[PDB]
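Lab notebook, bench 4. We co-purified these components, and the gel suggests they stay together. Before we commit to crystallization screens, I want a quick structural picture of the whole thing.
Request: model the full complex, all chains together.
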Amino acid sequence: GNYNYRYRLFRKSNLKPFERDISTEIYQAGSKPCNGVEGFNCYFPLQSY
Amino acid sequence: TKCTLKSFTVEKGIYQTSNFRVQPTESIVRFPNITNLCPFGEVFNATRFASVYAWNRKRISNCVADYSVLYNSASFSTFKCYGVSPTKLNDLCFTNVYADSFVIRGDEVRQIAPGQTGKIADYNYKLPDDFTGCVIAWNSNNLDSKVGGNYNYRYRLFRKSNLKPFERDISTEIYQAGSKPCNGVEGFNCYFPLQSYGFQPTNGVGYQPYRVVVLSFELLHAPATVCGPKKSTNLVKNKCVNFNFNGLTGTGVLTESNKKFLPFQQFGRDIADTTDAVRDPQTLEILDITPCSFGGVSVITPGTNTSNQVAVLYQGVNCTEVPVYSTGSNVFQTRAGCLIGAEHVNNSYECDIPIGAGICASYQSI
Amino acid sequence: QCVNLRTRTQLPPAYTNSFTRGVYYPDKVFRSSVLHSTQDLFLPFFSNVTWFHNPVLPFNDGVYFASTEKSNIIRGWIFGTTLDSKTQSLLIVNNATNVVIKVCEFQFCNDPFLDVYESGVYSSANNCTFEYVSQPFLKNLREFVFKNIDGYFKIYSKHTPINLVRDLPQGFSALEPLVDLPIGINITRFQTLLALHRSAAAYYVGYLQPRTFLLKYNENGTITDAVDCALDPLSE
Ligand SMILES: *[C@@H]1O[C@H](CO)[C@@H](O[C@@H]2O[C@H](CO)[C@@H](O)[C@H](O)[C@H]2NC(C)=O)[C@H](O)[C@H]1NC(C)=O
Ligand SMILES: *[C@@H]1O[C@H](CO)[C@@H](O[C@@H]2O[C@H](CO)[C@@H](O)[C@H](O)[C@H]2NC(C)=O)[C@H](O)[C@H]1NC(C)=O
Ligand SMILES: *[C@@H]1O[C@H](CO)[C@@H](O[C@@H]2O[C@H](CO)[C@@H](O)[C@H](O)[C@H]2NC(C)=O)[C@H](O)[C@H]1NC(C)=O
Ligand SMILES: *[C@@H]1O[C@H](CO)[C@@H](O[C@@H]2O[C@H](CO)[C@@H](O)[C@H](O)[C@H]2NC(C)=O)[C@H](O)[C@H]1NC(C)=O
Ligand SMILES: *[C@@H]1O[C@H](CO)[C@@H](O[C@@H]2O[C@H](CO)[C@@H](O)[C@H](O)[C@H]2NC(C)=O)[C@H](O)[C@H]1NC(C)=O
Ligand SMILES: *[C@@H]1O[C@H](CO)[C@@H](O[C@@H]2O[C@H](CO)[C@@H](O)[C@H](O)[C@H]2NC(C)=O)[C@H](O)[C@H]1NC(C)=O
Ligand SMILES: *[C@@H]1O[C@H](CO)[C@@H](O)[C@H](O)[C@H]1NC(C)=O
Ligand SMILES: *[C@@H]1O[C@H](CO)[C@@H](O)[C@H](O)[C@H]1NC(C)=O
Ligand SMILES: *[C@@H]1O[C@H](CO)[C@@H](O)[C@H](O)[C@H]1NC(C)=O
Ligand SMILES: *[C@@H]1O[C@H](CO)[C@@H](O)[C@H](O)[C@H]1NC(C)=O
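Here is the predicted assembly.
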């Protein structure tokens, strides 16, 4: 199994053409502020293949 | 003027350069008071759930459903939405909802998913691989589990075939494992397909009871009736804003009106199909819509060869909302609009540069 | 609990003139002192309306129903295609206090009637989908228009005090919208419901057709006159 390839899964908004995003910050899916703490309604935006 | 005329010299006269309009300030939305909520409380807060092989089925239609409180509440151990993201349920909606509720073990939580196999997934409840909806699961050890054993709940383990998607089998017939016939009496090759859950308060995590409810949303060609509330806000007056009154969108300034809408109309139009009055769905009062002001602008100049100072005329615009030429010089309000950069005199001469309504200007200043 | 009666309900199927009745508001838009032309389903002017003095009648596109009712003998209506459990059936009843609308696969008897001493004209009621309860609908001319377009069931109603003896009066009165149903059923036939004591009812039925009309709106937004654009050259 190859897992060197990862893709984004969550974003605040869409992407303008020919842009690049490499930042890896926790995603505040719910109303609860994650404040950099992983948990409920907080998920890693990068998913492997 | 030079740019529009595309020249570096301008002769004496009046020229039309551009337009002018009042921009909207903010937005407002109006919608009815919102009522007839879907009864999720009687489902999730039900005192007693049914067994997994006899899962309770409930039909939901013709109500407003708020999934925001369900998503925000952390009391649910497992919250798995497959068809769509939970945040988008409040926006679009389907024609009906089906809720299937039961109680299972804590380890069998992942069996209730598309493309899953197991005793529950093949003998009690089955989900199609194309199923759309959500699944909610939460521990109920303090309630469902009994110190003497919650033997009431049963699970099916034995059947020749599997269970179809959204298919329930509750047959209590003695399963015949072998080819030896049985006269309703369990023997070597005959057994009861149903066995009892053995929940206790001290059994360990994984064996504790878990209440599980799956929600499936269906979109038959009948009109949709169940989805989230429509947000609203207050309303303002005497200011050009844009509005979304009950699905009717448009810009303008809203004032009070004295028209008498007959008790079942919603909005009124006069002629050429242009809306003039609306009724807000909450206060139930008749308002009036007026397009906020606009018009063309013009410049009066005596010629570049003579001087370099000009005057500006706004056509058909009241001298109340003009806005560097906001104050400038003395402002004159005339039947043709408003004029800035020239002085009004009490004399009367011949007409040099026509302006309108019997008045015109000339260079002396202007 | 439903049994076929002995005597036949052979009502004389007479014909009479519609005159200028059967006009309803086509939308919910307020207009003041204006002439507006619209194309929709209407009852043609001076048409031939059927008079019954309880058969299954076709529904077609829409139905105009009228009754010079006395002491509230008519009670409700039944709508469907096969009129059994094989297809969804609509039922409307106006009892003493409320009106009840149900959408279920009933099993109606061969001669439904409400009976007196609530609903017992059906042997069974299964797979119910839609329910609704509201205020009562009802010398007393009751006019109703029933339409079914793209899964929407529209009911328009009007009540009038009359003093004429026998037939429909010569006059104009628009029908205001009453009720909307967001349910999809391909209704093709219907039936009338009577509550006759266990021991002489007249109404009028007409059909709608697509055509163009011209309507006049007065200052207060009420329809006071109309013209049929396909009756005679002067109207055109
Ligand atoms: C089941 O009942 C509980 C208890 O009444 C509900 O939890 C309450 O929810 C309201 C609305 O969010 C809160 O204001 C209360 O503080 C909650 N009480 C407790 C003790 O948590 C719960 O919402 C009900 N479930 C459903 C589906 O209606
Ligand atoms: C929608 O809800 C609002 C708020 O509950 C209702 O406004 C109330 O109307 C009554 C009747 O005049 C007043 O006594 C209250 O003071 C009003 N409350 C507020 C907050 O304004 C309104 O009547 C409702 N409208 C409909 C059609 O249901
Ligand atoms: C420009 O707007 C002002 C503000 O409304 C107008 O002043 C109004 O004039 C009418 C007619 O005399 C009065 O009845 C109002 O009381 C005035 N309003 C105010 C706030 O003073 C003015 O007339 C408008 N300009 C023109 C040319 O009509
Ligand atoms: C007329 O119809 C109404 C509507 O069904 C009846 O009122 C209901 O009666 C049932 C009978 O058990 C009650 O369960 C409901 O709670 C009642 N609802 C309401 C809104 O009242 C009424 O009883 C009927 N009257 C007669 C004389 O048959
Ligand atoms: C009993 O009710 C169910 C559910 O209301 C009906 O199931 C529908 O069956 C049709 C037939 O293809 C499907 O297209 C629908 O999606 C089903 N669900 C609905 C309408 O919600 C069932 O047909 C009803 N039984 C009878 C005899 O009409
Ligand atoms: C249309 O509306 C006007 C205004 O409400 C009605 O005029 C009133 O008529 C009543 C008669 O019942 C008089 O008592 C009032 O004095 C009238 N007021 C005014 C301001 O005219 C009118 O009757 C309504 N109908 C028609 C056909 O015009
Ligand atoms: C226009 O310009 C010429 C030369 O630039 C000058 O002689 C003439 O007087 C000017 N005309 C005016 C100022 O009206
Ligand atoms: C002269 O014009 C001003 C306004 O520019 C006015 O107030 C004044 O009354 C006028 N005087 C006469 C004598 O007309
Ligand atoms: C209405 O139908 C009856 C039944 O045939 C007929 O006698 C009568 O002339 C018709 N009226 C018309 C066509 O105006
Ligand atoms: C009614 O029947 C027609 C013809 O069989 C069909 O086209 C239509 O979809 C049906 N409408 C329903 C079942 O609501």
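Residues C 218-220 surround ligand 6 (CB under 6 Å). Worth comparing against the SEC data before the next meeting. Chain A is about 0% helix and 20% strand.
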